[model samples]
Target: LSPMPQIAGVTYYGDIPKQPKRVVSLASTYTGYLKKLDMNLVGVTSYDKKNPILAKTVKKAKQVAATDLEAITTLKPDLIVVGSTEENIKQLAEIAPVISIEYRKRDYLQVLSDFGRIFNKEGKAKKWLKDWKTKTAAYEKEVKAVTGDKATFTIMGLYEKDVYLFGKDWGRGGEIIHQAFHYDAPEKVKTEVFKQGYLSLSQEVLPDYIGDYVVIAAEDDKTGSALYESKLWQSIPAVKKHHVIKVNANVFYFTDPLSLEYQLETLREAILSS
Candidate 1:
């Protein structure tokens, strides 16, 4: 019941299983898609313990590393879906058909649609999409009501020694805030952040890319504390105005349907609270 005898613009390896009852999902992001299709996920990759959904849902499922071909083989999966290139593709192919999903470059919504056709769950996918659209529209309306038609935000992540900026598609929830909700980044942020898609800037120059609001992705409490203590950080307009929102590093750093679902309200709450 896959989308086609071919996938990712090429013929899939091996015969596509009829229903893929035993699926080994190397890509954590696509797990939600399979779950929505009511597929049996025999194995899953939980890279981070903080992964909100997989941390709980896949407790009974096999936990395998991307390169753990032995563990994957032991699972006896009918199909294997991989999101990252880190896995040994050829080795996995030796066990079962391997389908690669490029998560970063593809449109998440379109990918969601594809999952439906792939799993013969078009009805479920459509209904989920309709509900998602409704929720997105409601979120947009709520944000506009609070911040007017024009709202601007900057999304950034704080690592130990680096400050990473984000664009519409990547982890910072830019798609949900900027693309879906139709919010704007500051003029500086627009040219600097959107032009190259992302940037790794020094903390001293962070204010250059900040806007009316900011979403900070802090990996841990220690990093969050370090950011709050930075004098340069306290001087930003958004920071001074208390218009910055903090999201869990594990939560907002992914664009999976499940993560996005959890983020809808998290993003909306951040926007409305500002």
Candidate 2:
């Protein structure tokens, strides 16, 4: 039972169905949030095929494309969600109501609230937020006790020969570690690196940006950069003490409610174990 499109804050156009079922999500990042709302997800982009995060309800095998009008028309979705300011809005709207979402502009909580208002699930969203804060507060206390108040933490995304340092807002569980749990970051990271959200730091300078604890977000241990095997990487204090946690970059890439919730427990376990 979806609500009418009051569509607050977000950029959107077209006549949305009052109770849109068979809603299709073209943006991979937004799919998890739609699933959290228990919406009837019918379509997704080709990249989201067999994605574990969106494993339930929606059949990811039959995927669509943002530009492929033929496939979209065949699916007959009542509503469609796409990236902000997408070029094919006019054509997408012709087939079904298209709503554009901007990720970087809004934080995770605002996204939940916006989804609640749009989907007629304000109560559910409210409840989730309430529980979320309570759980986070408890988790924070537990984590802080283990890793002292002065102890710093950093979130790093590892790829094949690539590594990125993410700030409080740039996903990769940054919102949870920096905002929710209120973890401290290194001096260089706080002043310079966190300024633009994320910065690509080569293995040479990773020693500077690193903190007491490192949460390395990588898809696969062997698949990512061999920096972990390097002498410099092993020389780091956190690495030597095994005070690091590794997570799936894909799973931690999103700042949505579902992803954050999933991250909280894993983060708690990883940090406490180290």
Per-model TM-score on C-alpha atoms: 0.91, 0.91
Model 2's TM-score against the true structure: 0.91
Clashes of each: 0, 0
Top of the candidates by lDDT: 2
| Runs with alpha carbons beyond 4 Å of true place in candidate 1 | 1-11
lDDT values, one for every candidate: 0.77, 0.79
lDDT tens per residue, model 2, 1-274: 3454454447666766656778888887777777777777788765455444655446643577788889888887988989875688788989988778876666778777778888777888888889999999999999889999789988888867788898898888788999899998898888876889888887799888887988888777686546878899999999998988888776687776766777888898988777
Tens-place lDDT per residue, model 1, 1-274, is 4656333533366666767878888876677667766778888876534677546666667778778988998999889888655557778889998777655555767777777776677888899889988889988998899877876888898878788988777766887888779888888877777867778887778888886788888767677677688898898888999988888867777766777887888888877877
Model 2 misplaced stretches (Cα beyond 4 Å):
1-9, 46-50, 85-87
Candidate 1: Cα lDDT at 62: 79
